[PDB]
Amino acid sequence: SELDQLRQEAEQLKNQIRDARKACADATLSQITNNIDPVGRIQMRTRRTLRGHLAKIYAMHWGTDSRLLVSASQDGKLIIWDSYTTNKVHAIPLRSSWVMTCAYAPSGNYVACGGLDNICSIYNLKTREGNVRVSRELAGHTGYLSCCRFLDDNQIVTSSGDTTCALWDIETGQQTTTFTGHTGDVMSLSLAPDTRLFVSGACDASAKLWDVREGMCRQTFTGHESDINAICFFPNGNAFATGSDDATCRLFDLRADQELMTYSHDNIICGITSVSFSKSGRLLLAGYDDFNCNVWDALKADRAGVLAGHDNRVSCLGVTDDGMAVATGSWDSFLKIWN
Amino acid sequence: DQRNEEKAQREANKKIEKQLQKDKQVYRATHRLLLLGADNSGKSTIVKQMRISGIFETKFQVDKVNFHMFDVGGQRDERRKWIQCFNDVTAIIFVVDSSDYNRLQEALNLFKSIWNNRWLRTISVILFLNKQDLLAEKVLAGKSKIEDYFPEFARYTTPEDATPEPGEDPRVTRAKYFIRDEFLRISTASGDGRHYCYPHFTCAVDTENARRIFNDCRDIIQRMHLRQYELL
Amino acid sequence: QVQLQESGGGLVQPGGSLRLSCAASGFTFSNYKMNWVRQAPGKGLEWVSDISQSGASISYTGSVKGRFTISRDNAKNTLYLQMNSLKPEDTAVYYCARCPAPFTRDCFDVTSTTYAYRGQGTQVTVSS
Amino acid sequence: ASIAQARKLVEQLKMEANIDRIKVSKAAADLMAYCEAHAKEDPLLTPVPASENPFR
Amino acid sequence: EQHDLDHYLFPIVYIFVIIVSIPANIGSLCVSFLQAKKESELGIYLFSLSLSDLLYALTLPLWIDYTWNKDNWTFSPALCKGSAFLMYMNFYSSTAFLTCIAVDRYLAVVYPLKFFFLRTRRFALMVSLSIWILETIFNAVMLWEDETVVEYCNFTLCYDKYPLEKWQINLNLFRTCTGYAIPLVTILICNRKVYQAVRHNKATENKEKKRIIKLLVSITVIFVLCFTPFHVMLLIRCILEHAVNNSGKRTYTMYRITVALTSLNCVADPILYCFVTETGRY
């Protein structure tokens, strides 16, 4: 019938793509990088231990200026604190206590939360009245929100459990472009510094790079064997790292369109929950289910240190824009700043 | 000014901490329950009998104890990811229609997945076998036989520790306790005293399900205190 | 990329035997517990059997106990399920679904309407 | 519908096919050059004295 | 004073108590502070009780040598007065902490869904501080008075003589009432109620029910065996002296013996509250 030979052509296209991608293979990152002096064991200590959350922490996000931090907790709070003096500059109660992501605007005046209610709530942190209040209740998605990022003060990118990513105009609230193509539900998204491209990680072991203006998917990356729980762009914008339940974290580049290295050890076993690069890109920091985070050498694929010190599992991980600190949130209701 | 604003930051911090303590007291008092079941399981009937977008939230209180009950309906059937949020609830209220022999295997599989999950492995399950009147009627009917679907029913007898109704009729009792033991075999396969299931027999007419939930939550918290206020 | 290619589906007389294979190329095999999922015409997806790693802790659904058997060879990344003494009520399409995560004893959404790690599957028909 | 959804996989995979590629060695060299050219700035990569640290 | 019992059985008993109490008390302080970090009021109560036990362990050697040298305090009289004050305050602080921990366990197990405000770190610290302060205030009465007793054959029989102060007899009655009677009855009631609650529990297997039964009965029996003879014989001395306004020497001798039996509590309670304790075992 039509379906049989159409799937035959699809498999043929897969064969052609795989052959072309293998033609790009000349040498692995190891074969070029093997003659670089190793970074060496680096030590990072818990400079600050922010506390005040009554339940597990699900997501954190830094700001444009690497001072203010927002944390999302399932007890129903989106409280934000000043990391320098360990002071809570605001506390936001939520209509729905189940929140799985939080976003700090790149202008330090809006914050967004969203969880199982399928509604992205935007709060006005810099209101004239001085009292935080929900600004626009972004509704229309048919699934739990997994990650939201502020493209601008007026545009936001949200990824939900209904296998869709969206671009919302906050002024009106209606969707602008709907990103479809994932078979599974998307868990994490990461905007590029160029703010014209972004990659998404769903539970179908596939990484899809979208373009915000066109609304299509440019390239598709498939190297994992399990659900993707974290994704992050390399600082230059031509690579991105991906975490998964398969106890590995891989790095794909965009131009060659294939994976570069896999960062994993035999005893890792547990999955990866959050991943983020340093500003230079030499160090890849990945959260883990076994109550700790590991510091990976992005080019040597060797462990350089562990940020152990968390009681429960590590849920979120964020490196500041200046790169002077790294913050990890955990399910023990404690957020720690490492430096 | 810097000193003036630095002291200003402290006062806002203190005000937040005063509110946080006032909210921490309410959070620990209130108990959270997750309601799981299929479309025909019968969650609506019980949720109406204790009550009087996306997640449906129902609040009931008994013996001056506040209970928060969540029902997740807006999500898709895929639940391997959003079920991880409820790793801290007091208990998981599982509702199973015992009168449908075709969805029983799916209910057992869901119970097995919930029980052996790494994140919910410490959450006790208050099992609610609902709509027992339909089971009794269909057992006296004889049109549908459990032998067709569950082939271990033939070599099985009601346990001594049973509480049959005066009008239960032994076949209904045997069938009910077969379903309950089918679930309990999964329950006892893995898990220490941290994990436990509390099967209950309920129907659409039952109006005391809230009190049963209260008693089982009392037992769960009692076991937790046995562990933490070291006595165990 | 993860791929699960099924095989063996065909027309068989009621009471015969046919063997269902499942090629599993795209991931490490021995660290995943796989299932079998069927879907009859005019019905939803339903469980058939499940096998853990190393060929232990085997389970079947109640309708096909004894008649069905499941086995895996990690040396070949394959899953088999042998159907013997078929009945007209076994007409369905069989899927070689896999557990979402490795080193895990709980399988979730293996019978969901849209699953990432499940093959297109072969149609098994029984008629006189 | 099944042929409808499956066809969308064909056109999208066709679009991903006609995309200019580069050798992995060149992307590796670019990644290495970016990592090396910015090594001095990152405090995490190279421990900076306590004066620059705002958390010490 | 026979002085042979005091020269032989007292020193061995007290040195044994010291050597086993000191590490046990230190370990209990460590585990109790760790539990207090984890928001456990039982941690605060255990810390207070272990501090009392270690205070007794530290103050032991003075009284050990006192009993060794035929109950003659060749050191300064203020030293003997301070040592006696420390011993008394330790005993009654331990009693009050034991009744508090029993009441806390009962309030937590029997009523797990209620009485949240009585189970917090703030209340636990309040109770511990109040208990310490009240114990010091109550036992300052002897500090203001004199306990060194000069007895020429000269021997300073510090708090060892038949008879002694009438106000010390009133303090006898007050101590034997409010430091032992209330803790004893409250511990009995609370432990029995906890047993009743644990019996009807469903999650607890039969083996763990038996373990809890044994532990609770052991707590009660150890408390009674280490504290009943002290205050019972103290009341016996009160009714042998105040009523009558050799046998008296023997009565004071067995009173001394009861003192050593109570000294055994400082090694009895830390293990039974922290080592059989699984959480502290980890």
Author numbering:
A (entry chain B): 2 to 340
B (entry chain A): 11 to 62, 205 to 384
C (entry chain N): 1 to 128
D (entry chain G): 7 to 62
E (entry chain R): 8 to 160, 166 to 257, 263 to 299
List sentences quoted exactly from the publication behind this structure.
Among the over 800 known human G protein-coupled receptors (GPCRs), three specific receptors — GPR4, GPR65 (T-cell death-associated gene 8 or TDAG8), and GPR68 (ovarian cancer G protein-coupled receptor 1 or OGR1) — were identified as proton (H+ ion) sensors regulating signaling within acidic microenvironments. The three proton-sensing GPCRs exhibit different responses to extracellular pH variations, and each receptor has distinct preferences for G protein-mediated signal transduction. GPR4, in particular, is responsive to protons and engages with various G proteins, playing critical roles in angiogenesis, endothelial cell inflammation, and cancer cell metastasis suppression. Conversely, GPR65 is activated at relatively lower pH levels, primarily signals via the Gs pathway, and is implicated in chronic inflammatory diseases such as inflammatory bowel disease and certain tumors.
GPR65 exhibits maximal activity at pH 6.5 in our cAMP accumulation assay. To stabilize the GPR65–Gs complex, engineered GPR65 was co-expressed with miniGs in insect cells. The structure of the GPR65–Gs complex, activated at pH 6.5 (pH6.5GPR65–Gs), was solved at an overall nominal resolution of 3.3 Å. Notably, the overall density map quality is adequate for fitting the receptor and the G protein, except for the extracellular region, in which the density is relatively weaker than that of GPR4. Thus, the modeling of ECL2 was guided by AlphaFold2-predicted GPR65 structure. In the predicted model, GPR65’s ECL2 also folds into a β-sheet hairpin conformation and potentially forms disulfide bonds with TM3 and the N-terminus (C873.25–C170ECL2 and C5N-term–C160ECL2, respectively), differing from those in GPR4. Notably, in the pH6.5GPR65–Gs structure, the H10N-term is proximal to D8N-term, D131.31 and D78ECL1, facilitating the formation of an interaction network. Additionally, R2737.36 of GPR65, corresponding to GPR4’s H2697.36, appears to coordinate with residues D78ECL1 and D172ECL2 (E170ECL2 in GPR4), forming another proton-sensing cluster. Regarding the conserved H6.52 residue in both receptors, H2436.52 in GPR65 forms a polar interaction with T1885.43 at pH 6.5. Notably, L12334.51 in ICL2 is buried in a hydrophobic groove formed by the αN–β1 junction, the β2–β3 loop, and the α5 helix of the G protein, in Gs-, Gq- and G13-coupled structures. Furthermore, the GPR65–Gs binding interface closely resembles that of GPR4–Gs.
